[PDB]
Design a protein around this ligand. Structure first.
Ligand code: MG
Ligand code: MG
Ligand code: MG
Ligand code: MG
Ligand code: ZN
Ligand code: ZN
Ligand code: ZN
Ligand code: ZN
Lengths: 276, 276, 276, 276
């Protein structure tokens, strides 16, 4: 718990509505304002989904460029990580295309799983073509794993030379209905499983909904990094809607200050994530 | 390791070929002969997939009835458990239909996962309609779980009253490329996770390929039950093709005898699995 | 994590020196002042060792009565838990005798271990006669466990009817040089091992030195209770001396408030610990 | 699980009686006969305690030399590992002295624990002087661990350069009343904890009494080595006395042959244990 802590803010996502979370940033300007407040509260990475002005999820490259430019202009030092997951059911071609904008980092979903009432599909041949696109556009991946078997699947892609990023950054996404939950036994199992299978990988955790607090506090004291935000959780407390993404980031920064864990500077975040 | 041991023989499966495993039983008569040898070697359950005479996987109800009748006639006491998984890619309607034959037991796959180069699809709405069909035809399920999150998903179906079977029998299917592996850390994690989430559930393990021996020896001494067979593993030793499914069953029976774990009688197997 | 949190303050101990920790309470008056400040900061239990005015550890019943009375006079709501461990090397007769003062609670050390440069001795026959004295004097024990095997040893005393207290309160004491450390894998293992062996037991954790923060944050989100204080840790941060025991308690209360875990009232602490 | 398996036979011990186990070897001639039968059954190490002709435990160097010479004369290939634990209650000077006989290997008990009705004492200063005697006499240690905290204590002696043996061989001694039990969760925890704290250490497990089978089957498939014998367990099955130590060794050799795990040759056992 003395190693620097990287906080990611997943500020928008594909499914959160403005009716449930009135402070949900939808436009590039709203997303830039939120990103500045999150950076000042301690966030070093923004996990970015884009929306049309009507709130529907978007995959348009011009809209992604608009949001990336707006965020970059308010906080040049923040790391802008784009989502290649998008909205469940979106075509894989549309999910892959924004890598052509050459972001510093982007997500790489490592498997298929039932996801609420639907299926989040990542066909093995599509995972390989996405992994190949990361190499061609020189984008560093954040590999998203929702279950134990996805760690093994990623290890096999490393062994075959399909994923060559080293060190590799994994994010455990815990709490999806259909995926592994965020209970402490599970996060401890996952970090130890990852250490066995991909020994040099670094990791972060996203705890959906009620799992935000248990995943965050374990990650605090096990060297992991943490994601928070409206994409994953709109509540500050049970039954109490959050005021902003920055409010969620600031609580994690306050707990890190209480326990003496320093927040990573932008330079340290880029060094840990091998973005230089 | 003093509790009775139930051995399941998965004798055929959907993908194993006769060229790789010349002793693969394909016809109902061949499957009955294998089932008798497996029963005499210690198996109390047969996990049944059917094939056409040309070796292609089948879902025909008349072919399922032919195989069930042939096995029943050689060993009336064996438990015949039919597969509702079938061949990856088969239509869900064809996978569900054989429950109408009212077998004593059948498999119920609890989630979707990448499975080798393809996806084994179990849409959440199809899992619910299959669970409903088990109730209507008074069939006891064996719930197949390939990942941690599938245990939580099954617990939510129990909470909603969609799965009412109690005690419920779970089988951990470990070693699929895309699913959780069969390493000892994983089987220990899964039995403890299941005890937390579905405390009265019983369990078995199927260790695909190289995971057959590690899963079997852990299950031996943790009270679990074991599945073996050509569907999951065609080798008796690394690089040494097995002579029969009964050879694989007999090794497990010999190890159980060495350590003093009794094999379940047919009556004990039916009592543990709540088939009476 | 809405379950009430009981904070224990171990304010003095037997070995801490005022040379290392200038604000260590030594006398009954100093201990009463600290106990009131700890109670106001959120502590519901004081774990009490006594000292002579010169700072030497004491086992005298008149001195224990002086300290108990001084604390009760200024903060009657707090639970005063006396130590039967005392200073390593103390005679077992002197360690047992203060149970005759009929405190609400007292510690019951469940095994022997190397403890720094010495041995903390708890002979099996002495553990049994101490367990019998808890029954004789109607005192509730807090059972101190430093290793996995002490949980099994306590389970055997329960089976034999030597310990009949139900529910039983266990405290994991982690970080002793010679005992189990406070790394997160260990505290997760211990709570799970205790759930298997003594399913109805409640638990707390004391994290010695550098293990204070990792044990506290894991206990926060797993339903455990927490001990802090100069007996276990004199530092607020690595290389930063704590200002008082109440400063350590207040940090835990602030983290609990951040995450929405309520602090137990005195009535709830007595109900959970079965002190009524 | 193709890694060679080293079997140790702990043939006599200090406490086993011929009244409970009529075929217990007591004299040097009896111990030599048993050692040859154990070697032929697959054992590569003899863990040696000596007795007087009346069955009383001994620490005499002339009696140790008699037993070592008798075993070497009939089976020179076996590794003779002497006990420095001896009978609980024995003086530390008498326990250390036989290292002057310059055996190939000897045990090094890494902590104190309650042991049945007594205490097995290993004062921290005595552990250090024993570690120094291993260097003085050029003997390789087998470090005996009964609890998690003993692994940390050994790691601290390595850090201080008190133990310089590399690779270090640890034996987990599980099932002592007072020590960690041999349940599968515990052996999995211990091998993983040892991998975190002493990454290059090799390990074996001794499962006392009823824990012999669960520890052996887990070690079989996790790369560990196994100890068996009358010192730890006199029963072949629950309520079935073992016929000899070689009968216990032969069962482990049969299970290893069933699963395809080779037994170490004497040369491989000396290479793995760094005895050349
Ligand atoms: Mg949708
Ligand atoms: Mg706002
Ligand atoms: Mg196919
Ligand atoms: Mg044949
Ligand atoms: Zn996303
Ligand atoms: Zn099948
Ligand atoms: Zn104390
Ligand atoms: Zn011994």
């Amino acid at each position: 718990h003395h190693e620097p802590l990287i906080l990611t803010a997943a500020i928008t996502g594909a499914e959160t509505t403005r009716a449930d979370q009135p402070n949900l940033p939808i436009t590039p300007e709203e997303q830039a304002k939120e990103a500045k407040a999150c950076f000042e509260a301690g966030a070093r990475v923004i996990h970015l989904h884009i929306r049309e002005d009507d709130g529907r999820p978007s995959q348009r490259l011009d809209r992604f460029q608009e949001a990336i430019s707006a965020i970059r202009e308010v906080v040049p030092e923040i790391i802008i990580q784009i989502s290649t997951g998008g909205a469940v059911g979106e075509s894989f071609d549309k999910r892959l295309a924004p890598l052509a904008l050459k972001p510093e980092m982007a997500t790489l979903n490592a498997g298929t799983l039932n996801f609420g009432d639907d299926i989040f599909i990542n066909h093995p041949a599509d995972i390989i073509r996405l992994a190949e696109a990361f190499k061609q556009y020189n984008v560093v991946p954040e590999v998203e794993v929702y279950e134990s078997g996805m760690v093994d699947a990623v290890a096999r892609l490393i062994k075959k030379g399909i994923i060559t990023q080293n060190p590799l950054h994994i994010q455990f996404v815990l709490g999806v209905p259909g995926g592994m939950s965020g209970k402490p036994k599970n996060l401890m199992y996952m970090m130890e499983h990852l250490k066995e299978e991909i020994p040099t990988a670094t990791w972060a955790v996203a705890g959906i909904g009620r799992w935000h607090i248990p995943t965050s506090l374990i990650a605090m004291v096990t060297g992991g990094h943490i994601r928070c935000g409206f994409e994953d959780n709109i509540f500050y407390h049970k039954g109490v809607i959050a005021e902003s993404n920055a409010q969620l980031v600031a609580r994690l920064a306050r707990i890190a200050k209480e326990i003496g864990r320093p927040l990573a500077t932008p330079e340290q975040a880029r060094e840990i994530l091998a973005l230089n």
